[PDB]
Each structure stands twice: as C-alpha cells, then as structure tokens.
Ligand binder design. Structure first.
Ligand SMILES: NC(=O)C1=CN([C@@H]2O[C@H](COP(=O)(O)OP(=O)(O)OC[C@H]3O[C@@H](n4cnc5c(N)ncnc54)[C@H](O)[C@@H]3O)[C@@H](O)[C@H]2O)C=CC1
Ligand SMILES: NC(=O)C1=CN([C@@H]2O[C@H](COP(=O)(O)OP(=O)(O)OC[C@H]3O[C@@H](n4cnc5c(N)ncnc54)[C@H](O)[C@@H]3O)[C@@H](O)[C@H]2O)C=CC1
Ligand SMILES: NC(=O)C1=CN([C@@H]2O[C@H](COP(=O)(O)OP(=O)(O)OC[C@H]3O[C@@H](n4cnc5c(N)ncnc54)[C@H](O)[C@@H]3O)[C@@H](O)[C@H]2O)C=CC1
Ligand SMILES: NC(=O)C1=CN([C@@H]2O[C@H](COP(=O)(O)OP(=O)(O)OC[C@H]3O[C@@H](n4cnc5c(N)ncnc54)[C@H](O)[C@@H]3O)[C@@H](O)[C@H]2O)C=CC1
Ligand SMILES: O=C(O)C1(C(=O)O)CC1
Ligand SMILES: O=C(O)C1(C(=O)O)CC1
Ligand SMILES: O=C(O)C1(C(=O)O)CC1
Ligand SMILES: O=C(O)C1(C(=O)O)CC1
Ligand SMILES: [Mg+2]
Ligand SMILES: [Mg+2]
Ligand SMILES: [Mg+2]
Ligand SMILES: [Mg+2]
Ligand SMILES: [Mg+2]
Ligand SMILES: [Mg+2]
Ligand SMILES: [Mg+2]
Ligand SMILES: [Mg+2]
Lengths: 328, 328, 328, 328
C-alpha cells in the first residue's frame, strides 16, 4: 500500500558521492554503491580505518576536501560526536555550497534540534534495520532488506527521488522494502526499544535468579542454565522472525501456552503505563538533554552502573560458569 | 508615601555616559538623555545596528573603548549573552577603573549571582515597565512613566542620587513615578508573570477549544471567534489599565458578573498553590540553573515544544482562519 | 468550507422590520439596515432612549404596536427581562399573527427552554462578536465582521434565507463571515469564556499580588505596575488578534518563551478538569436555574461579592495608585 | 477604650418619632423614649396589638401616615416580612421625603443587600442584647444595658449623634454601654450563635441519651434528670453571667474540672473547623438565599424537622416525665 518496492537510479549519475566514516555501515554501503555503478570517494580521519578504506580501492581525502567535491554526503559516524564535527568543519563548507544532499542513518541529532543546516540543502534519512554485518550475507543472495525514509527540509522539490536513488545504491531494494516516515518516528522507536522492553527483560531475569536463590533455596549453577545460559532464547527469537510471534508458541506444550497467555493479558496495563511515561519523556526532548549533560560531566553514572552490574552476584556466578564450560 | 516623583540632575554633568547596545530600550534611552542635556557615546558590535546608531549622531566606538571613557555604563543588551561579554571584555577593564557606575534593565544575571563585580563599583538597577516603543508616544506628550530601582553594592555613599539622576535622564520622570526596590523583587516578578498567569491563560483557552470540539460537537471556525480571534481581549485589557480591574466588569451584563465572581472565589486556592510552588522554585535559584543548562545543551526542549504548539490542531485551524480573513 | 461569505437580499423587501430596544446593538443594526435599503420602525418603552431613537428619524411606536406591523422583529434587549416582556405583551400578539420571524442576539433564554414560541413562527439567531461600538469603525471602512447563526424552529422552509438576509442587513457581511450553528453552541461559549479563563486570570493575579506582599516582602505600589497597571496586557492581546497567539511570543525573549511553554504544558490537565466540570454544569441547565433563583431572592450574593472585591486590599492600593497617576 | 458611656440628647427635640410595630421591643423602647421627654406616635396594622398600643396613650395612625409625620422611624418588626412592607408602602414615601433617619434592631435584611434605601437617608443600627422583657426590671433599677451600633449610609454628616441620641432614648445608657460596629458584625454573630454552639449542644445531649439507653442499658426516666430535666443548666449559666465563665468551675469538684479541661483542649480543633465553615457560608451570603427560597416554597423542611424532633423518642419520654411532675 505504502511500501515502495523499487524506483529509478537517475539523479546520482554525473555526480560524485563522498562518504564519511568507514565503520560498520560505511563499508557495506560503500562497496554496494560502488558495485551498482557509482563514483565514490571516502572521508575519514587518519587512523587505522583510513588504511583499510584506502586498501579497498577508494580514493580517500580528509573530510572537508571530500564534501567539497561531492554534491552528496553519507554521514555514517556515531550519534554523539557528529555535532562537534558539523560545527567545526562542515558548516563552514556548507555555506560554500550551492546544492547539497545530506543523509544520515539516525535522526537523534536532527529531530531533537541539535543540528540546523541551511535552507539550500536537501535533508533526508536512510535507516537500515540490521546489525550491519549480516547485510553482506543477505546481499550476496541478491535479497534486499528493509529501511526507513523521511525528509526534514527540501529546497529542490526532488528530495524523495534522491532518497530512493540511494535506497537502490545500498542494495536494500529491490527484494526488500523501504518505508517512508519522518525523523521523529525513527529515533522514537530506536529509543523505545532501548528503554522499555529490553531493560525490563534484563530486570525480570536478574530478579528471578535472585529470588529463587535467596528465598526458595536453589543453586546458582542451576538457574542460569534454565534462564539464559542455554540457547533457548535465540532459537525462539528466530522462530518469531520467520514463522510469526504467536504461531511460534505451538512448538511449545499447552501447559506453557496457557500460563503464558493468561499472564500476558494479566500484566498488560502495568507496562503500557511505563511505555506511555517513557515515550512522553522522549517526545518532549528530555532524554537528549539528560544524555548531553551526562556527557558534559564525565560519564559518572555510566561508570558506577557498569561497575555495579559487573560486580553484581549473577555476573560473578556466570563468570564461574563460563569458566567451567571452556568458553571465554 | 515611598514613590519618588522627582530629584535633581547634578552628578551626571562633567561626566560622559557610554551606552552599550542600541536595541529597543537603547534607542529611546539614548535619545532622551541626549535631549535632556548630557554627553553620550555608544557601544555596540559592528553590525546593522551600528550603522543606525551612528546615523543618529552618536559618536560610536566599540565596547571596551567606550567603557574606558565613561564613568557610567548602561548595559542595554539581552539577559543571556551578558555573561560572556562581561567576562571577556569588561572585567579586564573594570579592574583598570577607579569609580564606575553600572546600571541594568534586569537583574536576572545579578540577583542569581551570575555576575560579581568589584567593590570599587556602584551597582544599581533601572527597570522600565513598557514594551519599549510606546514610550516615545508617552514622551512627546511630556508624560513620564513608572520604573523600579535598587542597589546591590555601593562604595561611594551616593548610589541613589546617580540612580535618580538617570531616572530623569530617561524622562520616565517627572510625570510618572519611580519605585525603590531590590534586584530580587524585580526578577521575581518579571518571571512570575511569565510562569503563572500567562501560561495558565493559554492552557485554559487551548483546553476549552479542544473540549468543545471533541466532546460537545462544535465547529472549529466558531470557537476561535468567541475566544480570542476577536478583539474582546485587548479591549477589556485597556479598560483594566484605565478604569480599574473590577469596576471594568460593570460594562458587562450581570449574568456575566455572577458567573465570573463565584468561580473566581471558587478556584482561588487551586492557583495560589501553583503560584507558591513556582515562586519558591525561583527564590531558591533553580530556574536559572535549568535555563543555563538548557542553553549548554542546544535548546532541544525549546525546539520540540515550538514544533508541537505550531503543529498542534488549534494553530492549524487558526492559520486557515487568518488565511480566510485576508490577514497574514 | 462552511463559512458563508454572502447571499442575496430578496425576502426582506416588501416587508417591514420592527426593531425592539435601542441600546448598543440596536443603534448600529438599525442604522445599517436603514442604509442598506430597508423600511424600519422601532419599539421601546418611553424613556431616555426613546427620544434619541426618534431623533435619528425612525418612526417609533411602542412595542405591541410595532410587532403588529412587522413580519419580523429583532429583540435587541437584555437577557434577563426578556421573559417578562414576552409573556406580558408579545405572546398575546404572536397568537394574532400568521407568519412571523423572531431573531435574537443570544440564546440563553431559548436554549434553556425559558421561551417556547408557537409553531407558526420562524426562529433564528444572529450573534455579533464585538463590543458593539467598534462595529461602526469597522463599518465605515466597508469591512464586515463575524457572526453566528442557527435555527430552533421553522415552519416555512425558508428560515436560513431570512437569516442570511439579515446577516447582510447589518453589514457584517460581506467582507467578514457568518458561521452556521445552533443556539446551544452559542450560549455555551458565551458562558464558558465567562466562567473559566477570565476568572482564573483574575484569581491568579489577585493571588500573585497577595503572595508577593505578605510573604516575600514586596511593596504594593511595585507589583501592580508589573502585573496589570501597565498596558502590557492589551498590547499582547492585540498581537494575538492580528499576528497569531503563539507567533506572538517571538517578540518576547527566549527566557520568557521557555518558562511560559514548559508551564503551559505542565498545568494543562489541571484546568482541563475545571473546564469539563463547568461545561457539564452548563449543558445540563443548572446555571440558568442558579441565576434565576438568585434573581428571585434579591441579588444577595452579588451584593456581598461586589462589596468584598471592592473592599479588598488590592483594590484599595490600586485606588491609591490611580489617584497618584492623575487618572480617575 | 471604645465603649461609649453617654452622650447628649439634642437632635431629637423639635422632631417627632414615629415607631413601627408594637411587639416585644416596641413596647419598652416606646415607653422609655416617652418617659425621657420625647414626642412619639406609633405605626401598626389594625390588629390586637393596635388596641393595646392605643391604650397606653400613644396617638396611633397607620404606617404611611406615621412615616409621613416623623423625621425618624424605628422599624421594630420581624426580620422576614420587612421586605414586602418596605417595597409596598415605605419606599414610595421615602421618595417623598427630604431628610429621614432609619433605624433597625437587626441588619439581616440590610447587610445582605435585601434593602437599598435612597441616598437622602440616614441609615443606622441599634441592637439591644436582651430577651426584651427583663429590660423593664433592669430599667426600674435605673441600670442601663449593652447595645451595638453602626452605620451603612450617611448623607448628613451627623448619623452617629442621632444614633447615640436614640441610645439614650431607650435608656440602655447610661449605666450600661454601647458599642460601635457595622451591620455585618451584628448579623454575623446573631447567626453564628444560632448555627454553631446551640445546635451542637442539643445534638450532644440527644446523642448521650440515645447512646446510654440503647447501648449501656439505662432507663429513660433516669438520664433526663441528670442532663437537662434539672435546673443545673440555668444555675451555671447564671454563674457564668456574673462570676465569670472559668472561675465558675471552682464551685464544682476537681474531678469535674480535670475531665472538663482536658477534653475542652482535646476537642477544640474539631469545632473550630465547623465554625470556620459556617461563618464562611454566612459571610458570602448563602444562608440568606437558602432561607429566602425555603420561604418561597412553603416551609417544607421546617415542617418535616419539627415533626421529627417532636415525634422523636427523647421528646416522648420527656413528655411522659413532665406529665409526671405535674408540670405542663
Ligand atoms: N550496528 C551498528 O553500529 C549500526 C549503525 N547505524 C548508525 O550508523 C552510524 C554508525 O554506524 P557505524 O559507523 O558502522 O558503527 P561504529 O560505531 O563502529 O562507527 C565507527 C566509525 O566512526 C568513525 N569515527 C569515530 N569517531 C570519530 C571521530 N571523532 N571523528 C571522525 N570519525 C570518527 C570512525 O572512522 C569509525 O570508523 C550511527 O548513526 C548508527 O546509528 C544504524 C544501524 C546499526
Ligand atoms: N521589549 C523589550 O525588549 C524590553 C527590554 N528590557 C530589558 O533591556 C534589555 C534588552 O532590551 P533591548 O536591547 O531594547 O531588546 P533587544 O532584544 O532587541 O536587544 C537587541 C540588542 O542587543 C545587542 N546584542 C545582541 N547580541 C549581542 C551580542 N552577542 N554582542 C553584543 N551585542 C549584542 C544588539 O546590539 C541589539 O541591538 C534586557 O535586559 C531587557 O530585560 C526591559 C523592558 C522590555
Ligand atoms: N456589548 C453588548 O452589550 C453586546 C450585546 N449583545 C446582546 O444584545 C442584547 C443587548 O444588547 P444592547 O441592548 O445593545 O446592550 P444594553 O445592555 O445597553 O441594552 C439596553 C437596552 O435595553 C432596553 N431595556 C432595558 N430594560 C428594558 C425593559 N424593562 N423593558 C423594555 N426595554 C428595556 C432599553 O431600551 C435599552 O436601550 C443582549 O442580548 C446581548 O447578549 C451581544 C454582543 C455584545
Ligand atoms: N426577643 C425578641 O424578639 C427580640 C427582638 N429583636 C429584633 O426586633 C425585631 C422584632 O422584635 P419584636 O417585635 O419585639 O418581637 P415579635 O416577633 O413579637 O414582633 C411582633 C410584631 O411584629 C408586628 N407585625 C408582625 N407581622 C406584621 C405584618 N405583616 N405587618 C405589619 N406588622 C407586623 C406586629 O405588629 C407585632 O407586634 C426584630 O428585628 C428582632 O431581631 C432584637 C432582640 C430580641
Ligand atoms: O522449556 C519449557 O518451558 C518446557 C515446558 O515444560 O513447557 C519443556 C518445554
Ligand atoms: O460577551 C459576553 O460575554 C456577553 C454576555 O453574555 O455577558 C455578551 C456580553
Ligand atoms: O524578561 C522578559 O522576558 C520581559 C518581560 O516583560 O517579561 C521582556 C522583559
Ligand atoms: O454534678 C456533678 O457533676 C458533680 C460531680 O461529681 O462533680 C456532683 C457535683
Ligand atoms: Mg538505538
Ligand atoms: Mg533498534
Ligand atoms: Mg521577563
Ligand atoms: Mg513583565
Ligand atoms: Mg456572555
Ligand atoms: Mg464572549
Ligand atoms: Mg438571631
Ligand atoms: Mg443571639
């Protein structure tokens, strides 16, 4: 209905694509755009990555020289230091440009207003949904994969066609799909998943273990095998990915289905509440402030929590165990 | 009783007044002090404003050169960037001075400790209560207007006479009045008005509209005419300004007076509570911290809220309407 | 979309329009209908107003004689004594009529069932949204202005065309607009504005003053200048009327915008609650009962509240002040 | 300090005093003013009272004829029907007057706005504090007694001297005293005593009896003797009147003093709350509305409560008892 499946590849010919960063996403996006018939250069600071990106053939300059040559740029770099870079190097050059297309992999720095490029620029988003590595395995098979798209500002009337051109340039289509959206509807999710259903999982596990041991008299080496020290989790995750979330449960016995569904519908509101709270905290722009300040202070809380979890009890016992199974 | 009406104009003769900034307040204060028989220079950075302030005759240097020549300075500039300026340019020069008089239009940066000048300085406040423009219309008529005054530090024994000298130098007296106060009793109000009775007004309106439409089946184009899209508001505001707040209501019918007064006395405590909370939040110095940090982060929340209100529903409908009345 | 801009002026020719009352709305409506080519008479009791309405040329009889001659009547009189009049004089005459058109400026007496005319009558509403005076200034410029319309009962199939005919007869269109609605959706608003966002404003102000003085040690003569004794209010009301409610705030500094918006979104629910309560109190018809009874008792509460507010503290100090600025 | 003890008796000579009503207060006030050297007439409707007031020498006309002759009037009649009378008869005559002095015994009808005389009238209050009868016994002894005074409106500059003239005209001074006050501070008390400490007394007694009987197994004929069927109450009331409220308790044993004082200080707040609530209910003007409406409906609730209390249990048993002691 609203899930674009393919487009043309016209605009990006006659132009040069200067890519920034050569990390996880950078490598594959670069190689794919190259293999699909596009001229490319690369921009990165002179470190270990520089040698490699040079190795694979790309003609590499440093950043400003790169943006100066391209009418397009893929800012494939972290979500934290982008601000400093944009303010030190790029913007001075942006003002020196006429028509320029800016693409990101994440809108955390845009949606929340931390960047405000000129009006003479085409602003867009291209959001892969993958770890980054397996994309290669999915590529050699010729299969595409999903992505999200959106615009924040356009002064050329043709932002979307450039967006889809790139969508093809990375091979995620055809074969996969590409959704159209906004920056907000992307960061919102990328953070909701991180704030709501993941940490709750971790806490539930950490609590079941502690309860069992300290109250019902269980041995530590036992629980961990049942809870996560076995591959059960990833197996059922795969069943979800392929066969469906709910239809998955048939492979389990009824005695499991009943106890699962009853509770699922029993403890639903309790977490809906939490999700509402957190989503509202985000939509307003608070979390960005929180994180930015913690950056401006020295990552104290980060430090203390990383010390606690690792120096917790469950982690100690798990270390003993892994030490016992021959693993790391 | 304690509302000074006029004083003498002695101290500021034989001295030079170097004014900083030439914005809204700067223009009129400058012109008035000039027309009342005082030598003046002007201090501003080389931008658009510089050309104009030069146009109107004032001999303009840049800031440091200005403060170096005057025994007095009127820091008529925003309430946010004053800190950076004072720390970069002025203080080095303050230490080079012997007797200097510092005047402001707002004490937000002083009362909350963000500035701490030397002990060899006369610190004062002069607070006009006007938009800035209409002061001219009130001046040509020869009428004064009200102001607030106060001191934070004095090492000359004669701060108040300089204060009143200036009070005359801007023409707000005689004809108007001048109150004596402190910096705190000024910022406190300038912020209470912004935090308590204004936003409550806006929220009440925004809520009445939403309720009417979404629940009682009203058309959007209708409400806005009753609530604020008509000039009712400013009319009664004027009646308040001139004839009195309460006596104003006679012009309205009784059926309005009853329903207004009963509720006024019904919902009084509810807002007294809020006002207490906010005033306490201020007196302590929290809001200053909040705002300063939000400045040090990139105005995220500012951004998101400005996006919400504008992209709300009421604003959309109002835009359609104004588009329909031929206005902007 | 649903905002009529003009119609024809056919039905009201060959007929006579007998107007009742000659107060604020009566004068201008009368003069305009006369200047747009319509025969008119006037109905009022023999008091001061009678002499004037006669002065301006209108051939005046007393009421019953007027309704007897016209097929239309504009009941431009208060919202309180209309009942007594309708029951004493008009209804006896209504029964003597064949086809008659009844128009009001407010539906408080209709929507709430206090009047129930025959079935042989055309019932309509015409609701100007103005103080009444400025309409003249808006008329000489040829500009129209907004109004609300609606029907309660029709036995002629052509109520709406008479409504629009009148809409033109008063000059509010063209140039302005005219909305279509019901009686309820009119009184509801005319009362919500009086019950919710006005008295809350007054109470917030009255509370800020009291708090400041009695707790934080401020002088009375000071606050009033900041809160309402200055023309700030009407200025920003005008900015709302013209440039938009929210876009208005740009002229203020950021430090104001932040503190305003955060709170606006913080204290929203608190007042939504109140608005719901009051709107429900109205929709049901309670307030009408309350007011009618208080009329049948002698306006005691009215009396006591008017004594309190005037004999309050804030009003005393404001009287001293106005006495000090040379105003009344 | 502020307790007038005597004044002169000048103004009321050369003038005629027309008194209204001849009930409890009327008789003694009339006779006293006559015995102190003043001309008097009387105003009352033609009923039983008329014959008597004529008997005692007073030259009696009916009301309007009376007010027409006097420059003063004492409206010694109930607090309920005064409105009807004032509106039917007096006001038409008031407008026919030049200088007139209006005195009352209670301000319930004034303070609460139920009467609004012209501006050409001297309005005052004179409030005896007595049953009405014992005043005679206190008069023959030559002793005065206390009263309250106040003004609501004066257009003669000499209201207070007329007030004190009357204060002497009724003999309550000298020997007694006269306080100066307002109408509000009079009705407020006359109603607080009726609403707070009296009914609480009655309820406490009614509850002790019921509790004792229905729970602790006591006979009805017993309790009533202890609680109120004995003269204990009036005895200690007299001790209060004469020797002091607290010093009274010495005559009782310590075992009583302890249990009384501890509880007095234990249950203090509980009733302070109630008193606040009721006083606020009054100050606002609600009770007046309540009562007026109940008058306009037919005294239903009055009826039902009078039926309940009388047809209660305690009253039945008390009737049996009084029937047993030979009393009524
Ligand atoms: N698994 C993943 O990491 C995925 C990445 N993304 C998005 O792509 C971007 C990052 O992806 P990757 O680069 O592949 O992961 P990454 O975290 O390994 O990125 C490291 C790269 O950042 C560059 N870099 C780091 N610090 C720099 C600095 N101060 N100055 C200049 N360059 C610096 C380095 O050249 C390095 O190659 C983010 O926006 C992320 O949201 C989206 C899907 C998942
Ligand atoms: N309607 C108003 O704006 C009123 C102003 N005030 C107070 O006066 C001061 C501001 O008044 P206005 O200047 O008339 O309004 P404004 O906001 O238009 O001030 C703009 C002026 O600030 C100068 N300026 C801005 N940024 C600068 C920077 N980085 N470096 C050097 N100069 C800079 C500019 O020369 C410009 O002329 C504030 O303290 C305010 O509280 C008091 C009453 C109301
Ligand atoms: N600013 C305003 O007053 C506006 C008026 N309206 C509506 O129009 C009507 C009133 O408007 P206006 O007359 O202009 O204001 P108004 O309150 O000055 O009306 C006074 C008129 O009512 C007449 N009148 C008063 N008592 C009377 C009585 N016992 N018997 C016969 N006639 C009596 C008088 O002739 C007098 O001319 C109301 O329905 C009101 O809701 C609508 C918009 C605003
Ligand atoms: N124990 C008391 O009754 C005291 C009386 N007062 C105040 O004095 C006034 C009443 O005092 P009293 O007359 O002595 O008690 P009251 O209740 O016995 O008054 C009865 C008198 O009212 C007259 N009256 C009753 N209905 C009338 C009507 N429709 N039209 C014309 N006249 C009518 C009658 O002539 C009758 O003589 C009240 O304002 C009361 O607050 C003050 C202190 C106590
Ligand atoms: O792993 C589980 O939870 C099983 C169950 O008892 O349902 C064994 C399959
Ligand atoms: O604007 C209002 O609220 C009015 C009322 O009904 O009281 C018309 C004057
Ligand atoms: O400080 C502020 O934002 C101002 C106000 O009037 O509230 C403009 C001076
Ligand atoms: O009447 C009482 O309450 C007494 C007591 O026991 O204190 C007998 C005096
Ligand atoms: Mg993420
Ligand atoms: Mg994710
Ligand atoms: Mg401010
Ligand atoms: Mg202000
Ligand atoms: Mg109204
Ligand atoms: Mg209104
Ligand atoms: Mg009483
Ligand atoms: Mg009493």
């Amino acid at each position: 209905d609203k899930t674009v499946l393919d487009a043309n590849l016209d605009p990006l010919k006659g132009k040069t694509i200067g890519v920034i960063g050569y990390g996880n996403q950078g490598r594959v996006q670069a190689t794919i755009m190259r293999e699909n018939g596009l001229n490319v250069i690369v921009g990165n600071v002179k470190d270990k990555y520089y040698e490699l990106a040079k190795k694979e053939g790309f003609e590499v300059y440093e950043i400003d020289e790169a943006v100066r040559r391209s009418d397009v740029a893929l800012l494939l770099i972290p979500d934290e230091v982008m601000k400093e870079v944009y303010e030190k190097k790029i913007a001075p050059v942006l003002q020196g440009k006429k028509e320029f297309v800016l693409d990101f992999a994440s809108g955390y720095n845009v949606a929340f207003g931390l960047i405000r490029p000129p009006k003479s620029v085409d602003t867009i988003m291209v959001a892969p949904r993958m770890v980054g590595e397996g994309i290669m395995d999915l590529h050699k098979q010729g299969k595409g994969y999903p992505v999200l798209l959106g615009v924040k500002q356009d002064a050329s009337g043709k932002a979307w066609d450039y967006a889809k051109a790139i969508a093809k340039g990375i091979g995620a289509i055809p074969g996969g799909i590409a959704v159209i959206s906004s920056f907000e509807e992307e960061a919102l999710l990328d953070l909701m998943s991180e704030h709501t259903w993941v940490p709750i999982l971790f806490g539930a596990i950490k609590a079941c273990y502690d309860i069992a041991v300290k109250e019902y008299g269980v041995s530590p080496e036992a629980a961990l095998l049942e809870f996560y020290a076995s591959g059960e989790l990833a197996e059922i995750a795969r069943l979800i990915a392929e066969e469906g979330i709910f239809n998955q449960m048939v492979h389990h016995s009824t005695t499991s289905q009943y106890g699962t569904l009853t509770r699922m519908f029993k403890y639903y509101d309790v977490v809906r509440r939490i999700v509402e709270n957190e989503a509202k905290y985000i939509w307003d722009g608070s979390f960005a402030k929180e994180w930015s300040l913690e950056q401006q202070a020295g990552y104290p809380v980060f430090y203390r929590l990383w010390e606690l979890a690792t120096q917790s009890e469950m982690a100690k016992a798990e270390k003993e165990l892994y030490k016992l199974l021959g693993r790391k």
